[PDB]
Amino acid sequence: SWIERAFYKRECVHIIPSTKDPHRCCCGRLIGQHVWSISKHTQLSPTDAFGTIEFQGGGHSNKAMYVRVSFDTKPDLLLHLMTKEWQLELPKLLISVHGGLQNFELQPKLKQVFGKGLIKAAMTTGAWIFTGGVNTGVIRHVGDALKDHASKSRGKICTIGIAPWGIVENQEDLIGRDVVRPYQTMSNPMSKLTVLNSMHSHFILADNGTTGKYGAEVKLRRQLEKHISLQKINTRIGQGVPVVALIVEGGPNVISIVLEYLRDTPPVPVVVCDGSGRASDILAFGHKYSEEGGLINESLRDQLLVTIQKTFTYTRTQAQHLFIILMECMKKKELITVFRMGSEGHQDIDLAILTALLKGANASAPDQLSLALAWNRVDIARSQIFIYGQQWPVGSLEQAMLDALVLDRVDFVKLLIENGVSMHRFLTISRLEELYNTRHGPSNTLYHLVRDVKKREYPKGNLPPDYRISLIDIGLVIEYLMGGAYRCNYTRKRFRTLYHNLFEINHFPFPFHELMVWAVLMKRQKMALFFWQHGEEAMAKALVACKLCKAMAHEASENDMVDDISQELNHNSRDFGQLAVELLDQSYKQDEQLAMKLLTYELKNWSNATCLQLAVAAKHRDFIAHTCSQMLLTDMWMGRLRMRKNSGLKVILGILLPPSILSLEFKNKDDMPYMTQALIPLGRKIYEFYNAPIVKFWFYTLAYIGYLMLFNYIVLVKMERWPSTQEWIVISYIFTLGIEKMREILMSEPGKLLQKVKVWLQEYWNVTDLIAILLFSVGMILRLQDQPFRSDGRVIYCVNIIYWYIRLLDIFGVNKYLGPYVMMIGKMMIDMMYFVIIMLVVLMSFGVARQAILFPNEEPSWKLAKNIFYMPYWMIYGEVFADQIDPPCGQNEQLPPCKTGAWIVPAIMACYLLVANILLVNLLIAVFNNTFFEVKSISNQVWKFQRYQLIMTFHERPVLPPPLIIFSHMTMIFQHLCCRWRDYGLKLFITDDELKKVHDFEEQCIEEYFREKDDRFNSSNDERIRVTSERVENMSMRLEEVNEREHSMKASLQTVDIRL
Amino acid sequence: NVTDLIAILLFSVGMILRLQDQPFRSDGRVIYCVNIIYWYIRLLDIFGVNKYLGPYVMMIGKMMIDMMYFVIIMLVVLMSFGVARQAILFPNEEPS
Amino acid sequence: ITDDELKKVHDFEEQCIEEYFREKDDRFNSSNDERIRVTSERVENMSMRLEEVNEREHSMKASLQTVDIRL
């Protein structure tokens, strides 16, 4: 409704002057067909012709919006229509295509080159194409180019055409108000009126009142182009949008339009094409034969006059006037870029167009760089802005670096860095908070994270819209997303002190770390992959990025956001994990010991952590299952012991015989010092042996086996009123194990006790241990009383011995073959459960039927439910109860009489036994068999992942086994009281030179991986085939041109031989 | 649906036999036991809704044909051994 | 649905149809077999055209030799 109330229209209410034809008025319409003010006396009214046009026919179906406007309307209102009602963003480039209104045909290769150029130019910059609207001549060529574009590309080219309203065929067909109107692409050759072009996007059909006459649109199009060019571009460096003027063929008027474009403030560059003919060819012949602009000698002046008089069929004075207008154009010869087919005329439309825009702007190179940044054309920037000898202002390159960063232009970062711009000198604290607070580029979820951590920190709520996200808030986001005891460098007291005292000290020592974190947080994947290559600590950066992407994917799924976001962040997490795995593979291929040093050393920039800890916290199964991590974990397992030959027996012999300890080959003092917080050799050997995790595990295993044997003795032998010595040892083991599990609860990661309890009950073995310890205390309390509670305590003791015998599988989980077997059993338990369900259905059907037939007169008693399940369950395991299948009855051998329907019981027994024993057992065999391989590979990888958890658990465990652990517990309470009265991991703590060689080894591995990946991509079959096919294409077109030039040279040689 | 119709007709026959006196009441009880076999089997319709139990049930239905062919070959071998054992160990038998 | 929702549903269907069709065309044109066939055929036309170019080059060399002999 706004279009009718804002735009106006004019209709022909005149005195009907006949002039030549009595029906034809001044407006050209029929004399009875009626219903500027000079001789038309036109009246103004709201519009009645606007909406959408459905182009019926002409191949592809395409919808184009349209509106009928007055020719005298102000262009700001029209612009506002395009920006608001048609939802068109402000273009980064305006193209004005002018040419002859008569239809013409060009060369096929010229038409193909011009069409491909116009399509690519309007695609890559997102331009607006301004045509004549109707389907005549150059606009017909533009429509054919857009037809080829619709036939082979994803683009929607905004190709707004402006035509007069009076000349378009079927004017009554386009009458409506926000109504879709079908249109016919057929044009009657008898009618002088022409149809609109089918492949246009918008129409600004302008009515001056007259019909069948031009000139109603040129002024309006010119003021709209000017008004667009006064609008500032989004770079906000101080320039408007650039305007180019493409000229194909043309008539006598297009020289005047070229003059009007050149003699304008600001000037507009003009690109012409050669080979079409008419005004373009005379412009080209003027441009090549021009010398110093307007300095044209007499002979080519007369040649230009005779070509104007011959091609344009003009008189002598008309040709002289056109030559005067030509010279007035040629005064500004620098603005005209002439494209020539073949030769060295840029071999392309678009290089000519874009460099014409570049030197028509004629500004400083920062303005040119901001233009190329807005157009997303790194190729033209590299080829012409960054040419040799280009002067650059101080500080402009860093401003363009910032602008390329905030707009997500990765290749522009690459070009600016290659040019020389360095992150160390560019990155400041202020620039990075500006980067975190940008609004350009793709969408992101970071405002939700900062809102959640602000709600959690100060329980406010929703942030203000004009909120500047500080780096402290970003640090809190890293703390929450990483989880655990991670402490980001922003939240430390040093950076908060620097932030309070300031809002090379403000420069970042590792700027690529901050750029990596910024890129992953604001969901810019290509930027993060670019920043991963550059800088040190690549594997740490990859694992941190993997954890960040996984945890933001989880948080986005938790806040009920778009699921496509969560899928993309999971894909980014899997990509960063795959990078980390390939880096580990490269480091393992180069040097094993440097790879372990890379995996183990403390990362001061990542909360004092370890690459192994970061991989475990990211739950990266493939990282720990890699051979290098497995051998590092094996080295961590043996502690300070070389050994590594017939393991198990030597450490058992050392535990049982203490003088066997000193006959062992111990490791060096500084061979691989994995530490948590950074007679004498005999004592050092004793202390180094007894703190090894393998030694602690075997001591724990021997104590558990001895306790299990004592429990077996106290349940098999009878017990007296008071417990024996063996039962006291078993009770002591249970109590000290419970105290040890309580100490594991208290020495955990969270602060609030319910969170520690929840994170400790997240393991199934811990909750079953707690249930067993409570069951033992209940049974012991019942046993210490008199009868009949002592037998109940004995029964609870038997249930507990079932549990501890099952818990031997925890000890069995350490072996390389038994552990995967155990979790494989755990995987097959689900298929067992489904089998148990179907067995349950069939079993109770047979049980209910058998019991209800064979026992008709029964009272309500719970023995019926027992008889339901009793014999049919044992029928599965080879006991069919053959004496009770069909006993002889109703005869004398006096037997009791036959129950009615007792013969049914063997028949349904036969059906039940067949179904159960032959169907469901064999089906469960099939389910166990066909899911074995996936389950087996998964259990192997999961066991190799949980080796780390086992090693850390046994390293953090006390030296003494549980039955003697009360002495070590008293040692820690005494030490804790002494520390009160007066960092969980195994890092290496290298020096600075070792850090230097580790970093250089990491850079060598990064370059090796990257351009080995490039070598594999370049030597693959698909890439070779594609490359060969494309070079065959260029070869065939060039050889066709060579054949044409060879024919021309043969004709010239024949003429020269005929002459001489 | 056809098994449901057969079961409902069987229940009405058994209930009609049960509402009389002896010996038809025991026959109605026997028909009730055959029907409880059927409804216990028809729990698999409710089980067909779960994402894992449903495919399991129709998978069982697919393997029933291979069971039938096994039952045929077992039937041939089983009656060969049964006829041979009974006809050797019991030479003097009346038609029964 | 209403009529406007029918309109956006129909336009979404047309977008999906064009996406499927000329993505299928892109997959057909970037496949290895089609590339190999295209390269072989353009090598055929290239070889016959280069044989014609060699014949015309021999004729042009003979004409240039005759013109040099004349002058």
Ligand SMILES: CC(C)CCC[C@@H](C)[C@H]1CC[C@H]2[C@@H]3CC=C4C[C@@H](OC(=O)CCC(=O)O)CC[C@]4(C)[C@H]3CC[C@]12C
């Ligand atoms: C390190 C692992 C692999 C083995 C450690 C366990 C054994 C050294 C323990 C566990 C069970 C113990 C037995 C449990 C019960 C008894 C009965 C006990 O006899 C009595 O209690 C009645 C007579 C008396 O009081 O001496 C004599 C010791 C003995 C054989 C114990 C001997 C030592 C055993 C074999």
Ligand SMILES: CC(C)CCC[C@@H](C)[C@H]1CC[C@H]2[C@@H]3CC=C4C[C@@H](OC(=O)CCC(=O)O)CC[C@]4(C)[C@H]3CC[C@]12C
């Ligand atoms: C640390 C635990 C988990 C296993 C370690 C094994 C041994 C240190 C234990 C297990 C069985 C124990 C034996 C179990 C029973 C007895 C009988 C016991 O006889 C008496 O006490 C008789 C006199 C009395 O009735 O008081 C003397 C200790 C002895 C040999 C124990 C000595 C220590 C043994 C060998």
Ligand SMILES: CC(C)CCC[C@@H](C)[C@H]1CC[C@H]2[C@@H]3CC=C4C[C@@H](OC(=O)CCC(=O)O)CC[C@]4(C)[C@H]3CC[C@]12C
């Ligand atoms: C004396 C009678 C009552 C026999 C006892 C039978 C059950 C109480 C036991 C026998 C085998 C046990 C299972 C053997 C192996 C495993 C894998 C293990 O689980 C894991 O290692 C976790 C990983 C995973 O589940 O895959 C411990 C649970 C489970 C299912 C056990 C659960 C308890 C089970 C079913």
Ligand SMILES: CC(C)CCC[C@@H](C)[C@H]1CC[C@H]2[C@@H]3CC=C4C[C@@H](OC(=O)CCC(=O)O)CC[C@]4(C)[C@H]3CC[C@]12C
């Ligand atoms: C479908 C399959 C995989 C599982 C279904 C079978 C079980 C649920 C059944 C089969 C045997 C049943 C047991 C058979 C006998 C008894 C003894 C009964 O105790 C008595 O009768 C008291 C002592 C007596 O009177 O002799 C209590 C139920 C119980 C444990 C039954 C509990 C249910 C059991 C374990």
Ligand SMILES: CC(C)CCC[C@@H](C)[C@H]1CC[C@H]2[C@@H]3CC=C4C[C@@H](OC(=O)CCC(=O)O)CC[C@]4(C)[C@H]3CC[C@]12C
């Ligand atoms: C108490 C005694 C007599 C045991 C009863 C034995 C049979 C009457 C039952 C036991 C298992 C049943 C089968 C379990 C599973 C299926 C699949 C289900 O069929 C479908 O879901 C249709 C699709 C398909 O057939 O694959 C119902 C029929 C069938 C063959 C059942 C037919 C009846 C069976 C053979």
Ligand SMILES: CC(C)CCC[C@@H](C)[C@H]1CC[C@H]2[C@@H]3CC=C4C[C@@H](OC(=O)CCC(=O)O)CC[C@]4(C)[C@H]3CC[C@]12C
């Ligand atoms: C789909 C499947 C899982 C259904 C399984 C149903 C049966 C196994 C249950 C359901 C109702 C139960 C009955 C509910 C009530 C009683 C009465 C009860 O009587 C007494 O305890 C005596 C009363 C007294 O003297 O206090 C004996 C068990 C019994 C027959 C139960 C036996 C087992 C039944 C038949």
Ligand SMILES: CC(C)CCC[C@@H](C)[C@H]1CC[C@H]2[C@@H]3CC=C4C[C@@H](OC(=O)CCC(=O)O)CC[C@]4(C)[C@H]3CC[C@]12C
């Ligand atoms: C669902 C699957 C995965 C697990 C199987 C669960 C049930 C089939 C079991 C678990 C608990 C069992 C019940 C536990 C205790 C009893 C009491 C028991 O009573 C007696 O034996 C009374 C003594 C007598 O008179 O003999 C009869 C069986 C019954 C109902 C059991 C029937 C079978 C039940 C329901």
Ligand SMILES: CC(C)CCC[C@@H](C)[C@H]1CC[C@H]2[C@@H]3CC=C4C[C@@H](OC(=O)CCC(=O)O)CC[C@]4(C)[C@H]3CC[C@]12C
């Ligand atoms: C090849 C396999 C898969 C199937 C072949 C086996 C069945 C067809 C057989 C095996 C057991 C047979 C049953 C064994 C015993 C009897 C009891 C019989 O009734 C009596 O003898 C009346 C009571 C009495 O005299 O004790 C009726 C036949 C029947 C149901 C038989 C019917 C045929 C059955 C089910």
Ligand SMILES: CC(C)CCC[C@@H](C)[C@H]1CC[C@H]2[C@@H]3CC=C4C[C@@H](OC(=O)CCC(=O)O)CC[C@]4(C)[C@H]3CC[C@]12C
């Ligand atoms: C290829 C396979 C499937 C062939 C299987 C053949 C046998 C299982 C059948 C076929 C003929 C049957 C016999 C046909 C006739 C009789 C007489 C019949 O006698 C009576 O009923 C008594 C007569 C009266 O007093 O009324 C007892 C069963 C019997 C032996 C049948 C027993 C079972 C037989 C041997």
